[PDB]
């Protein structure tokens, strides 16, 4: 409703860097808000794409940002009569970024890994990896829970059970308020998908450079399965956290599996031991139900509600014809120990191929009426196909069915405006939560400041 679409702020990265692929707000130890930006195709030392991360100080004028530096060199360790290898070429550092406390977590889902032993090998595969930074102190750490030293022959013998070679850990990411990092790895267990969790504190204290293979004892990984319903489900394509079991001491995980059960798609709510509490099934095959998930209490009863994006949902229209427009599903959490019922509200895109619901960002309470609100992206929506972000306001019965405000892309065609979103943080300290929108196609980020309601 009250985001200012006239005076925007623009941050920009190098051409072709995909600056703005991912982003988040970052508060330093003094509470000063900055913007961390991932640029997964930033050039490295060898003039080769490796990705990169930028930490943008808040300025109304915006502009260029300094780099948040990470080691981009390939590593090699000869130990235990084996040879460990990391490969950072085209690893996509900054394909996801998230901030917790005064720490930044930036991931490279497509970092490859291999282990050589004489003539055999583990196979060169994208286990993925995450880089952690404490900007103020300069502390650095890494986390790559899918790295292993098992040779190829062994996997073949055991029918590829517990095969974490293609995890792509960090594909998606989130951090609990308690400081537990949770990574989505959609390629885990031969593309079933898995989650990897570990306290940030333990990642730092257990990490040392040059080791490449080390234990994080406090970590917890999800489980493999023989059920074909999970095969190629990309469990962990998206991830989020919230409170859904009525126990405030426990933190529940929300996991998106957009190709679950032969591309039907699904979203699951689990406890911290990866035990399934609920499962939301997709409505339409190939709609990619679970591409994005969002957790926020929209109707002000103190109970977290669930939003799920299916950006490729085909709406039914006249003459038995279908139109790909995308759809968002709202699930209100019921009072006490009960299952999430049918959706409370269905929001459906309008523009053909607009991909409405590709991203869903909690905005907090934008208009300050006591109800939290959201922003939904249609990165190729709008009458021009340049992209749109639609704001929906909370209310006692859930969300409004019509948007209170629509943000048209200020960038050219192909910018993918709205592919990444983040809200619920007051960056200019005016008492209103603001919205940052990534447009990696244009290598830029737009900041929308919330203003007093008119």
């Amino acid at each position, epitope marked *: 409703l009250n985001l200012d679409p006239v005076q925007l702020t623009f941050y920009a990265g190098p051409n072709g860097s995909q600056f703005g692929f991912s982003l988040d707000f970052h508060k330093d130890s003094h509470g000063r808000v900055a913007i961390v930006v991932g640029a997964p195709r930033t050039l490295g030392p060898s003039q080769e794409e490796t990705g990169g991360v930028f930490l943008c100080p808040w300025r109304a004028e915006g502009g260029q940002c300094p780099s948040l530096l990470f080691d981009l060199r390939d590593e090699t*360790r*000869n*130990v*235990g*009569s084996q040879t460990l290898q990391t490969f950072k070429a085209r690893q996509g550092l900054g394909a996801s970024v998230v901030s917790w406390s005064d720490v930044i977590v930036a991931c490279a889902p497509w970092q490859h890994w291999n282990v050589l032993e004489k003539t055999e090998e583990a196979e060169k595969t994208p286990v993925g990896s995450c880089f952690l930074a404490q900007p103020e102190s300069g502390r650095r750490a890494e986390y790559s829970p899918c790295r292993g*030293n098992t040779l190829s022959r*062994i996997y073949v013998e055991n029918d590829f059970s517990w095969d974490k070679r293609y995890c792509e850990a960090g594909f998606s990411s989130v951090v609990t308020q308690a400081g537990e990092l949770v990574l989505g790895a959609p390629g885990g267990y031969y593309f079933l998908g898995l989650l990897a969790q570990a306290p940030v504190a333990d990642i730092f204290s*257990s*990490y*040392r450079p*040059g*080791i490449l*293979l*080390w*234990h*994080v*004892s406090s970590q917890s990984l999800s489980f493999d399965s023989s059920n074909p319903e999970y095969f190629d489900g990309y469990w962990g394509y998206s991830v989020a956290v919230g409170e859904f079991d009525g126990d405030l001491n426990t933190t529940e995980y929300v996991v998106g599996a957009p190709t679950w059960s032969w591309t039907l798609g699904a979203v699951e709510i689990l406890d911290s031991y990866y035990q399934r509490l609920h499962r939301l099934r997709g409505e339409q095959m190939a709609s990619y139900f679970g591409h994005s998930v969002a957790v926020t209490d929209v109707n002000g009863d103190g109970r977290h509600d669930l939003l799920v994006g299916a950006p490729l949902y085909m709406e039914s229209r006249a003459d038995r014809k279908l139109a790909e427009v995308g759809r968002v599903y709202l699930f209100l959490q019921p009072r006490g120990p009960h299952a999430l019922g049918a959706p409370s509200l269905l929001l459906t895109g309008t523009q053909l191929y607009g991909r409405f619901g590709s991203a869903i960002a909690p905005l907090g309470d934008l208009d300050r009426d006591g109800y939290n609100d959201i922003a939904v992206a249609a990165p190729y929506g709008g009458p021009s196909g340049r992209g749109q972000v639609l704001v929906f306001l909370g209310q006692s019965e859930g969300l409004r069915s019509r948007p209170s405000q629509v943000l048209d892309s200020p960038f050219p065609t192909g910018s993918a405006f709205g592919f990444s979103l983040r809200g619920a943080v007051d960056i200019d300290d005016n008492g209103y939560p603001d919205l940052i929108v990534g447009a990696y196609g244009a290598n830029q980020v737009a900041v929308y400041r919330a203003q007093p309601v008119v």
Partner: antibody
Amino acid sequence: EVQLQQSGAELVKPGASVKLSCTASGFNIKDTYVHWVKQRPEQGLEWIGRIDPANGYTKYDPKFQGKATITADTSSNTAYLQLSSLTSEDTAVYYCVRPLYDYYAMDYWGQGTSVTVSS
Amino acid sequence: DILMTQSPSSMSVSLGDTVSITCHASQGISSNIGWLQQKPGKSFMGLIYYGTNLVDGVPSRFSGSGSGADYSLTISSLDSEDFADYYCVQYAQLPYTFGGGTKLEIKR
């Protein structure tokens, strides 16, 4: 806290066999490699082998191939070292070992099990 | 197998001294070395791993260094508890092999 608690001292005859145990305390035995090391006053420390209790795969120093047999039961959270066709030279102290962080290291040690072969 | 030649076999020193134990491998092991401590009539405790990294709980007066095929364990300001046996171990290659050992004794 990580503690490796081994079995009591063994007193056996030559030609017989013995099976030492190494029970994990405060952690899952399945987490890391578990090694076995032999110590004698003169010969000093010698590496017997290792086992990955998550799958049961083992490695051995070719010197101990035949006598040493390392196994593990994740149920009882315990690793074992079986010694066969015992000899006076098998009279030694045996330690079970695991790493802290580094996959290949040798950081945490059990108290050691004393073995004595005699007629 | 990789031979680990540890020296000296023993040394007579006093409290507060800064001593250094060395270890020579028959070939390069690239910091894939660990240092161990065995107090009189007791089990082993890990000091260093990967050449220079302190095991959790170990005092900072301990420190490892070196590269290639030559490494060192240093103890700044000896404490009454530091008088014990010290071994090095390489895990660059299987089978793991140990040094001969070094015993720190009280000088008088």
